[PDB]
Structure 1
């Protein structure tokens, strides 16, 4: 990985050593970035709803996985299921049980730093993973991108500044998540986020991720070209908010 500080260094080291398994997957690959483009055409706001009980940023919610996920299946373009145990209280079991209950695309949210993690996601029933430009070396990032695609996934490439953007573009990203929160500090910067989103090339599906609590931020962002919105904390706290986000 790259030089990492603080809780990122910790979780990355955790992820390098986490156990992988031998398996066979069930449900076929249901493309998320493709489903985002269908929703765009159907003029349904595309929301990637995350299920995560905890988060470094302070989220703290106890909610049933299956009931949450069945409810969201009715509205969301896809689900982001946290599988990182220490900082998100997720697990491989949580992804597995959810991927079996629902028939929409599922993004495994974790710190993907080795190839056996992508085998895990595939075997667990995930349809894609996120790969983080700040965490991976450029040649790790290119390789894992290609490794995910070899399975039939299109990874979401997570960026934060124009430099993450040059790297993600250079190594052939087509599906990009612009984070509003710095992964290290967890400081939000929507002004820097909006700048990046305006910049993204026409040929790339883009996602505005983190810090959305209102339907009217979704609107102003839509005028920028935003294809989908990664929302978790607000939905974990009040899942009826999804009705707000999509109207």
Structure 2
């Protein structure tokens, strides 16, 4: 990985030593990026609903994961399940349980630094994984991208700034998420997010990552070319808000 400090360095240390699981996948790969385009074709707002109990940005919500997932199955284009344990209070068991109960695509959201975590994702039922440019070297990103693709996943490559974007396009990422915060400060910077979205080629599937969201913000981002929205806080606090955001 790359040089890091603060809590990011700690979480990467944890990921490096995270033990791999042995498990049989129970369902085929359901492609998240392909379902997004199908939603786009029919002009249905495509929202990836995040399940996470905690976040360093202050989220703290206890909520039945199955009740949430089965609700979201009726409206969301996919689910993102955070499996980082120390700062997001996620677990592999939660991913496995949700993956065995819904039939929409599942993004495993963690700090992936080694191939065995992608094995974990596949074995537990995820349909794709998140890769973060800021914690990986370019050569690591390229290797893990190819590794994920060998399983038939197209990973979501998460970018924060223009240097991230250059790396992402150089390695051939086809599915790119754009952050609205930066990791170290946590400060929201929506101007930078809109700036980056406009620099991405139109044939890349683009995902805007948001905590709090409103319909007018969604509409503006869609006009700028965003294909889908990865939304956490608004929906963890108020699942039913997804109806307003779509209609």
TM-score computed with the length of structure 2 as normaliser: 0.99
Verify the 8 A CA contact 1:56 1:87 in the aligned structure 2: yes
- 1:234 is aligned to 2:237: no
Structure 2: how far apart are the matches of 1:123 and 1:112? Answer: 15
Q: CA deviation at 1:212?
A: 3.5
Q: Which residue of 2 aligns with 1:55?
A: 55
Whether contact under 8 Å (1:70, 1:102) holds in the other structure is: yes
Using the TM superposition, give the Cα deviation of residue 88 of structure 1 relative to its aligned residue in structure 2, in angstroms: 0.6
Deviation at 1:94, TM superposition (A): 0.4
CA contact (8 A) 1:181 1:211 kept: no
* Equivalent-residue separation in structure 2 for 1:10 and 1:90 (angstroms): 16
Alpha-carbon distance, 1:184 to partner: 2.1
CA displacement 1:29-85 (0-9 Å, x = unmatched): 000000000000011100000000000111000100000000000000000001111
Structure 2: which 5+ runs fail to align? none
Q: Over residues 126-168 of structure 1, what are the superposed CA-to-partner deviations in whole Å (9 max), with x where a residue is unaligned?
A: 0000000000010000000000000000000000111100000
Aligned to 2:210: 210
**How many angstroms does 1:216 deviate by?**
1.2
Offset, 1:185: 1.8
Regions of 4+ moved over 3 Å: none
- C-alpha separation between the residues in 1 aligned to 2:100 and 2:21? 18
User: In the TM superposition, what is the alpha-carbon distance from 1:183 to its structure 2 partner?
Assistant: 1.7
The root-mean-square deviation of aligned C-alpha atoms, in Å, is: 0.7
For 2:211 and 2:63, the matched residues in 1 are separated by: 20
Separation of aligned partners in 1, 2:70 and 2:21:
27
Q: In structure 2, how many angstroms separate the alpha carbons of the residues matched to 1:34 and 1:185?
A: 34
Counterpart Cα distance in 2 of 1:45 and 1:29? 22
Distance of 1:147 and 1:24 partners within structure 2 = 19
- Number of matched pairs: 247
- Say whether the 8 Å CA contact 1:188–1:211 is kept in structure 2: no
What residue ranges of structure 1 are gaps of 5+ in the alignment?
A: none
Three-state SS of the structure 2 residue aligned to 1:18 is coil
Q: How much does 1:215 deviate?
A: 1.2
**With structure 1 as the length reference, what TM-score do the two structures score?**
0.99
Deviation at 1:187, TM superposition (A): 1.2
Cα distance, 1:202 vs structure 2? 1.6
Deviation at 1:102, TM superposition (A): 0.3
Aligned equivalents of 1:197, 1:236: Cα separation in 2: 25
